[PDB]
Design a protein around this ligand. Structure first.
Ligand code: ZKC
Length: 121
């Protein structure tokens, strides 16, 4: 497919699968500062999957690379805030990251191929 716009619905569908994963539940809404009172000492740019879906639906991503950067920030924030590599929540983040990366690969390749075809002449 050389459809330059196809990534958006493909990302909406992938976010729907991520919301069905039990492994996403900690990452769906912004971290709780009442429960994790030191969170913002450690983490400068909070990110979560509801924020990513809302940014997509607002038309405030120009490319699937920008969406991929924000999703990867969810996972780097979990790794930076974890006290241990054997954390429940960090452990869930690593499975959900593997799932995300397996599915986003074709979305990125197809978009980049479509843009190259657009500038072929
Ligand atoms: C669903 C609803 C929002 C209504 O329920 C709530 O209000 N509570 C609620 C339930 C689940 C999840 C969250 C939000 N997430 C959350 O607390 N963290 C903690 C920090 N963190 C880490 O990556 C991490 C690494 C090591 C330890 O934590 C990101 C996930 C809130």
């Amino acid at each position: 497919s050389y459809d330059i716009q196809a990534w958006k619905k493909q990302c909406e569908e992938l976010l729907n699968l991520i919301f069905q994963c039990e492994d996403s539940e900690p990452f769906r809404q912004p971290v709780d500062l009442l429960e994790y009172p030191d969170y913002r000492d450690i983490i400068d740019t909070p990110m979560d999957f509801a924020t990513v879906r809302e940014t997509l639906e607002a038309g405030n991503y120009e490319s699937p690379m920008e969406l991929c950067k924000d999703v990867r920030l969810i996972f780097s924030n979990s790794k930076a805030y974890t006290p241990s590599k054997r954390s429940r929540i960090y452990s869930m983040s690593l499975r959900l990251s593997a799932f995300f990366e397996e599915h986003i690969s074709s979305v990125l390749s197809d978009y980049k191929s479509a843009l190259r075809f657009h500038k072929r002449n």
